[PDB]
């Protein structure tokens, strides 16, 4: 801008940018060619780069962090910005450069889904390890002690293999564990025969398995015995695991095909990931395609491509000519052959190396189901939480939709006997709930002097609690059977 030969639009410049790409933050500097993307996609990538898996810190072996994810084979991107040298993304990368074809193959990558190579995944592609740390203290108030519980002297022991614990009440590293397996044996003494101690052991999460990785035992601040147990879980990429590009193109894995089922180039290269062509045009992530082209050029050339945004030395035509110099089609298309029939595909598929990240959202940490489990103590409804074996909420909008269906019986069973079936004995003169002694068959309403005219009414427990709260507020919601 500082050239007097032109009109120059100004001649009183006081300052200059050091580089215009410096306006981006830490997460936005990871985006290659962010000036070729639509801005909401840059925002989405800035969000999801915080969810990528890599090596989060070098000393992760000594840290007993809760919820740690480590990728086995993180790679630095083939297509990088110059700010990644200062973000130290080269030394702690989060992702793998993957050969990716943008194609419609068998329809399992439709609508923001991807098709992964099963043979690649067998070779450690995007294989990660999940770490979860469990901590527990023993306290002196009632004394808690780390010890292996025994059925002859402990109360409340679950039906778990307590033999996995050692003599100190703690499990050892290298032991395989599953859900509801005791890892720390803790017994609290009863304040006042057959049982003298009460079981207060800690188990894993119900849907979580793994190997015990590290057990650390120390003193806490208040001078009590303190233990931390890290559980190692190896996570294979599977159907439903979330994968994202560096351009806001997230997507779960739809299916995994083996190498012989994947499409292949004339050189036998099969894609690691196949993404749908329809993910591109409404999103306008052209930086995705340019990064793919530059990755092809970089991998063939033997260098790392520069994708600093406001760089006029790099454009699509120069990358295309460089790719054409290496014996490929200049726009990155290749002739693919069908993996099932061997016939070459009529359309030539855009394929090349581009940088994906494995996001923290695995399906195995989200799959939840319940038949009948624990219920809340106030209302006798299913609890909240996958970790507490809770039930899903059939909310108000669900009730509205089931009303609009006309399905009165399904709505009734969901809101009555799939949540909290209950029954009360109510007087017939007053609508106040009566006293019911079921085994003596003496159902009486004190207040009405009513001994016989008592009706059993099947009503939800939450409605009974509501009516009892109303009578706590001096309201009489008299239930009349007539």
């Amino acid at each position: 801008d500082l050239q007097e030969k032109e009109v120059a639009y100004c001649s009183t410049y006081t300052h200059c940018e050091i580089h215009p790409s410096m306006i981006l933050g830490v997460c936005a500097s990871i985006i290659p060619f962010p000036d070729h993307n639509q801005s909401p996609r840059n925002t989405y990538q800035s969000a999801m780069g915080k969810q990528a898996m890599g090596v989060y810190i070098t000393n992760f072996h000594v840290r007993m962090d809760t919820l740690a994810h480590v990728l086995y084979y993180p790679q630095k991107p083939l297509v990088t910005t110059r700010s990644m040298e200062y973000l130290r993304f080269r030394e702690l990368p989060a992702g793998i450069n993957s050969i990716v074809a943008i194609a419609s193959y068998t329809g399992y990558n439709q609508e923001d889904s991807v098709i992964m190579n099963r043979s690649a995944v067998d070779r450690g592609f995007f294989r990660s390890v999940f770490y979860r740390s469990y901590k527990e203290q023993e306290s002196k108030k009632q004394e808690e002690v780390f010890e292996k519980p025994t059925r002859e002297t402990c109360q409340g022991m679950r039906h778990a293999i307590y033999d996995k614990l050692d003599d100190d009440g703690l499990i050892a590293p290298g032991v395989r564990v599953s859900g509801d397996d005791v890892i720390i044996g803790k017994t609290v003494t009863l304040p006042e025969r057959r049982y003298t101690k009460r079981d207060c052991s800690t188990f894993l999460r119900t849907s979580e398995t793994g190997i015990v990785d590290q057990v650390m035992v120390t003193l806490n601040q208040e001078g009590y015995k303190f233990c931390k147990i890290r559980v190692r879980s190896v996570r294979i990429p599977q159907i439903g695991d979330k994968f994202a590009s560096r351009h806001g193109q997230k997507g779960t894995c739809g299916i995994q095909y083996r190498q012989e089922d994947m499409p292949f180039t004339c050189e036998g290269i099969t894609p690691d990931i196949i993404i749908n062509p329809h993910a591109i045009p409404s999103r306008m992530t052209i930086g995705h395609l340019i990064e793919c082209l530059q990755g092809k050029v970089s991998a063939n050339k033997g260098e790392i491509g520069d994708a600093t945004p406001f760089n006029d030395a790099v454009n699509v035509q120069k990358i295309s000519n460089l790719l054409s110099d290496y014996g490929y089609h200049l726009r990155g298309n290749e002739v693919l052959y069908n993996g099932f029939t061997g016939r070459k595909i009529t359309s030539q598929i855009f394929i090349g190396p581009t940088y994906y990240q494995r996001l923290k959202h695995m399906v195995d940490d989200k799959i939840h189901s319940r038949a009948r489990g624990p219920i809340q103590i106030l209302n006798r409804q299913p609890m909240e939480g996958r970790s507490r074996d809770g039930g899903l909420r059939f909310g108000e909008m669900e009730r509205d939709c089931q009303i609009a269906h006309g399905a009165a019986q399904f709505l009734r069973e969901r809101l009555f006997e799939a949540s909290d079936p209950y029954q009360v004995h109510v007087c017939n003169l007053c609508g106040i709930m009566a006293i019911a002694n079921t085994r003596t068959h003496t159902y009486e309403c004190r207040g009405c002097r009513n001994k016989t005219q008592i009706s059993l009414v099947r009503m939800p427990y939450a409605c009974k609690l509501l009516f009892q709260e109303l009578m706590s507020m001096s309201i009489a919601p008299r239930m009349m059977s007539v």
Partner: protein
């Protein structure tokens, strides 16, 4: 509308309240229809006339303009329980207890509270056993 050379037939308003106070309840029903149709089909979308007509008829069935708030829905004779299912449950139940209001248990929300079959869809009738048709069985 009273001005010279102003058409008193076609001159209308966006304001629902003054159309109600000037032209009446059926005119404000039609105006509410037209305004809702405009705000729905401005973006080219289409909604069947049944739903717009039912919304306007529900909002204009009581002679006055019944706003879809706590100030129009919780002020009609809908019973304490379905009123408290919407909003101000404690205030509605306090008023019902103070006045001794009886809930006839005819709506869907009351039967949903009491866990009974809502008179809605499959619950709007009763099934009886035909004794004579059972004679031809095996």
């Amino acid at each position: 509308l009273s001005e010279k050379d102003v058409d008193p037939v076609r001159t209308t308003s966006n304001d629902i309240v003054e159309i109600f106070t000037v032209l009446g309840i059926e005119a404000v029903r039609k105006a509410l229809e037209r305004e809702l149709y405009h705000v729905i089909s401005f973006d080219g979308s289409y909604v069947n006339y049944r739903h717009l007509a039912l919304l306007c008829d529900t909002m204009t069935c009581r002679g006055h303009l019944m706003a879809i708030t706590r100030h129009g829905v919780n002020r009609q004779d809908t019973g304490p329980l379905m009123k408290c299912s919407f909003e101000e449950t404690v205030d509605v139940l306090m008023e019902a207890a103070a006045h001794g209001e009886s809930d006839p248990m005819k709506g869907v929300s009351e039967n949903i509270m009491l866990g009974q079959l809502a008179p809605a869809g499959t619950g709007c009738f009763d099934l009886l056993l035909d004794a004579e048709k059972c004679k031809y069985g095996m």
